[PDB]
Amino acid sequence: KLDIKKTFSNRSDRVKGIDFHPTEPWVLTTLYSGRVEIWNYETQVEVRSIQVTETPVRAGKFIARKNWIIVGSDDFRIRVFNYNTGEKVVDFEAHPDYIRSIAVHPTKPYVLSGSDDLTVKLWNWENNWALEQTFEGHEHFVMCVAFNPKDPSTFASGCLDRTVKVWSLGQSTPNFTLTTGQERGVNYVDYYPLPDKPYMITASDDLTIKIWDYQTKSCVATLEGHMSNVSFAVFHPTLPIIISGSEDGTLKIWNSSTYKVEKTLNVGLERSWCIATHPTGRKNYIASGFDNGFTVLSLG
């Protein structure tokens, strides 16, 4: 039963990136101010924070495997910190332009970064963070990268050039390019995590959200309702719903079967920029980052 409860919200500078730890009640936020925070959302106490740089930090993920966080910023750099000690693990220039998005491979020591330099790059931490592959083909800022959880030898990039490209590790060209018809570009791409549907989802400045069948390349549905740029849209890992956030300042929960809006939330923190869902669906936790801070919600 959809019974949405606010677990924890705090105010901060604009949060551009967000992620859940899989075994600790922690959420990571990365801010436009160059700061990153790890909050325990149940005790409502800060566990660790770092002033990483002076530029926006747009991307941040836990690497629970290694007790790390990995972050990417407008100063062109990827940095990794141990969250137990605060020690900096590595610090390198990844792209000659903004880093928009970082994805972590679930079983292999690989990280993907998407950039305004028109590329996605693959880094290998068991090979001294060497650059192992550059994926070229996009024609505008690549805004989002995501592994297929059902087959992480492939991944998707969403780009302001109005396309999504799907790639295989070890190969130089996309397996396919999706021409979305979202003419103001693609800000976000996500996979449906379960094996019954070959679905992907995209969000755009053109105010639409689109669902795709990645086998036929067809648009299954178009979700309209937001009144300003849609920053993200994701499938929930366990609940039959879709969650989106917009510069109109709302989160929307859509029925994933009928594609109708079930609930619109204005959490009162201005524009919404980022989203995370708890990897195992614990308390059906979700978290979103906004102009004025973040909120962690229990959906049911």
Binding site: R14, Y32, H140, F141, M143, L160, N187
Partner: peptide, 5 residues
């Protein structure tokens, strides 16, 4: 710069 914010 698109999407500066």
């Amino acid at each position: 710069k698109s999407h500066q914010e």
